[PDB]
Each structure stands twice: as structure tokens, then as C-alpha cells.
């Protein structure tokens, strides 16, 4: 119940490999690498449906700038990114299928890391 203290440099070192695993997926990571601009992309309802957008570059910036206090907050951001994509996109779309592949990759990477951090 009393939270152990995680130093930001320890979270960055431990969790960065799991984020690198996502980024290295090609073609599957491409639509997830940067924040979206709905007006430029032609999806103007995106922020109506997706209340809390999330993307790989934003997660990397949060690790780089010490914005997570505990590892589950990082896991929550990765899964927010996944859940937003499964909510917004149709099941036949590239983004939807790519999201499913990233979730498979992430599940394998994150488990031993979460065990090691405690
Ligand atoms: C869109 O899929 C691909 C697949 C491969 C490659 C793509 C794009 N690009 C452009 C990358 C940037 C694209 C992002 C992105 C774009 C659209 C989008 O404007 N749409 C309208 C018509 O097309 C389908 C949907 C939707 C979504 C998008 N992503 C985030 C997760 C928000 C979302 O939930 N959905 C680079 C080369 C490889």
C-alpha cells in the first residue's frame, strides 16, 4: 500500500527497451510514432471521440523528462494508445490491425520488466 520510490533514471533505463520494441516494428509502429493533427489528416472527429490522445513520441518524452512516478503509469499510457486506436478505427483498417500487433509485442516485453521493477 505504501508506494516504493522509483527514481526517474531507473524507470527510463528499465522501460525504454520496451518502448524501443514498439518503435522498431515496421510497418506497424508508423501511425503511432507522432501525435496526430486531426485537421491536417482529415479525421476532424478524432478529439471528439478520443479524449486523451497518446503516441510513442509523447511516451518517450515522458520517460526522458521524468514524468512517471511508478511503472504502471507507463503501462497505462501504452494501453491508452492501444485502446484509443481500437476505439477510433474500423476492424479492417491498417491502424487497427497494426495496433493488435503492437499489443502482442508489448505483452511479451513488459512482463519480465514489471517483475524486475516490483
Ligand atoms: C493510417 O495508417 C497508416 C499506415 C501506414 C503508414 C501511414 C498510415 N502513414 C502515415 C502515418 C500517420 C498517420 C496516422 C493516422 C492517420 C489516420 C487517418 O488519417 N485516416 C484517414 C484515412 O486513412 C485511414 C485513417 C488515422 C489514424 C492515424 N493514427 C493514429 C493512431 C490515430 C488513429 O487512431 N488513426 C505513414 C506511412 C505508413
Contact 95, 87 (CB under 8 A): no
29 — phi, psi (to 5°)? -80, -15
* Rounded distance between C-alpha atoms, residue 38 and residue 59, angstroms: 19
Distances (CA, A) of 101 to 41, 107, 117: 23, 10, 25
Name residues whose C-beta falls within 8 Å of residue 43's C-beta, 6 or more positions apart in sequence: 36, 88
Residue nearest (by alpha carbon) to ligand 1 atom 12: 31
* Rounded distance between C-alpha atoms, residue 116 and residue 118, angstroms: 6
Residue nearest (by alpha carbon) to ligand 1 atom 28: 31
Domain CATH for 6: 1.20.920.10
Name residues whose C-beta falls within 8 Å of residue 87's C-beta, 6 or more positions apart in sequence: 49, 50
Name residues whose C-beta falls within 8 Å of residue 80's C-beta, 6 or more positions apart in sequence: 52, 54
Give the distance from CA 49 to its chain's centroid: 18
Question: How many domains are contained in the chain?
Answer: 1
* Rounded distance between C-alpha atoms, residue 92 and residue 60, angstroms: 29
Residue 31 Cα to ligand 1 midpoint, Å, equals 5
H/E run at residue 87 = helix 71-88
Distances (CA, A) of 107 to 10, 15, 62, 65: 20, 13, 20, 24
Rounded to the nearest 10 degrees, the angle between the axes of helix 94-117 and helix 71-88 is 170
* Rounded distance between C-alpha atoms, residue 73 and residue 113, angstroms: 14
CA-nearest of 75, 92, 85 to 32 is 85
Residue 57 Cα to ligand 1 midpoint, Å, equals 15
Contact 80, 62 (CB under 8 A): no
* Rounded distance between C-alpha atoms, residue 26 and residue 98, angstroms: 9
49 — phi, psi (to 5°)? -85, -40
CA-nearest of 86, 103, 106, 117 to 21 is 106
Amino acid at each position: 500500500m505504501r508506494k516504493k520510490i522509483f527514481k526517474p533514471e531507473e524507470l527510463r533505463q528499465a522501460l525504454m527497451p520496451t518502448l524501443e520494441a514498439l518503435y522498431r516494428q515496421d510497418p506497424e509502429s508508423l501511425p503511432f510514432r507522432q501525435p496526430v493533427d486531426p485537421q491536417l489528416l482529415g479525421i476532424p472527429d478524432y478529439f471528439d471521440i478520443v479524449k486523451n490522445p497518446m503516441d510513442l513520441s509523447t511516451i518517450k518524452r515522458k520517460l526522458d523528462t521524468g514524468q512517471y512516478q511508478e511503472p504502471w503509469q507507463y503501462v497505462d499510457d501504452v494501453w491508452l494508445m492501444f485502446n484509443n486506436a481500437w476505439l477510433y478505427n474500423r476492424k479492417t483498417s491498417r491502424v487497427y490491425k497494426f495496433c493488435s500487433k503492437l499489443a502482442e509485442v508489448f505483452e511479451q516485453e513488459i512482463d519480465p520488466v514489471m517483475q524486475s521493477l516490483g
